[PDB]
């Protein structure tokens with residue numbers, strides 16, 4: 145199989161966004177940061193090349209890109225000769241931008257760019273160590289009702305317990321999520337229960353993050369909010385959706401333990 | 404309802420099946436282990452709150468069986484909705500079930516995520532052989548590429564490549580790995596070695612089997628006095644396998660992940 149851009153399948157952001165009661169004018173800005181761990185092609189003499197791709201898709205794009213289709217598209221590079229690493233980057237920018245509907249950023253990095261890079265955890269307070277009982281696994285947004293009754297604060301919280309399901313594969317999705325906000329202080333137990341209630345919930349990573357953002361916004365009414373999740377890869381690609389009131393991109397992209 | 408804890412999901416594969424194709428001797432030419440990293444290990448505590456961890460498993464190369472990866476993933480997924488009273492119980496069950504499957508005692512570490520903060524991404528030892536100006540048009544497996552490959556003065560060298568790719572036979576899907584070869588013997592021609600490794604690109608075999616094939620081909624064609632072949636493959640469905648085979652060494656010094664892992 146040679147290089148084949150037709151393998152890419154877009155999915156519109158509007159599907160879920162409509163389900164969240166969002167207008168065309170978004171409550172958030174942001175991007176989906178993808179890591180492509182398996183990018184490989186042939187040089188111009190047929191010798192294999194390997195790299196890690198770092199891609200950013202703007203949250204304003206009409207479409208996200210379905211992950212398996214992205215994987216299959218990348219696999220079409222594997223037996224294809226390209227003139228130079230610059231040609232690979234150019235082709236990726238062109239094809240991914242066309243699919244998403246807006247210019248996509250792409251960095252193609254040699255493997256030695258990662259030597260001695262440290263694994264990171266998230267920022268602020270981890271909310272996971274709570275002695276509490278969970279009596280059911282059904283998604284409930286109302287777990288956030290009255291969750292922010294505290295004094296005005298600015299703080300950053302995170303959890304490693306985010307799990308959702310990938311319906312189109314009927315397989316688990318695993319993520320950590322960081323929530324930074326300015327507003328009435330949030331009840332930690334409510335937030336953790338809310339996140340745990342995704343466990344049996346079918347949704348895409350991008351859609352889950354938008355749901356978390358919009359639920360926090362409507363129940364907790366912070367003045368400023370950023371939600372950033374880092375999910376473990378599916379088929380050699382991971383997705384790290386970032387949604388913020390004021391921020392366009394995260395100021396760090398670094399892999400976590402399970403990624 | 405999701406399937407809860409189910410050891411019957413584990414699928415053993417006898418190692419001897421593929422080893423027969425390698426025409427080995429009565430006693431194994433190598434020793435070693437298969438090191439697995441389980442990046443998605445999660446279960447519920449007794450009060451129902453999720454727990455997350457990374458597992459590290461070592462299966463002796465002398466075990467009667469290896470464990471089929473997809474079955475291992477499904478087995479691990481069966482923990483996800485299951486309540487366990489302690490992390491110790493989880494580690495204990497993993498040792499018990501995986502040892503029973505493999506046919507020999509396996510080691511299992513269950514590590515909290517904080518144990519990985521600041522841990523490095525690593526490369527392999529020795530010299531990378533990948534930057535060569537040569538043309539490859541034929542990706543079919545050919546072990547004869549190693550014929551007369553070691554002409555050199557007797558040396559001790561460590562060589563590695565990030566270009567190992569094979570196909571995963573259940574799915575046919577591509578497998579991606581780096582491989583580290585340490586030997587003492589006549590110096591190996593690096594073009595021949597790289598062409599040989601690249602010839603796996605269209606080839607169907609398990610990671611463990613590919614490493615054993617590389618070891619046995621180098622042994623028969625290059626006749627080094629001592630040899631170690633160690634490959635580290637990217638994960639499939641949340642689990643990776645890192646087969647280590649050696650004439651004189653038992654195991655690698657660490658499980659540290661590489662860039663694509």
Ligand SMILES: *[C@@H](N)c1c[nH]c2nc(N)[nH]c(=O)c12
Pocket residue numbers: 469470471472473570571572573578608609610611644
């Ligand atoms: C494909 N490479 C594949 C599929 N199942 C596997 N199990 C094991 N133990 N090794 C593999 O390489 C496997």
Ligand SMILES: *[C@H](N)c1c[nH]c2nc(N)[nH]c(=O)c12
Pocket residue numbers: 208209210211212309310311312313317347348349350383
């Ligand atoms: C599973 N969660 C899944 C399957 N395909 C996907 N594509 C994208 N863009 N996001 C996901 O979470 C996906």
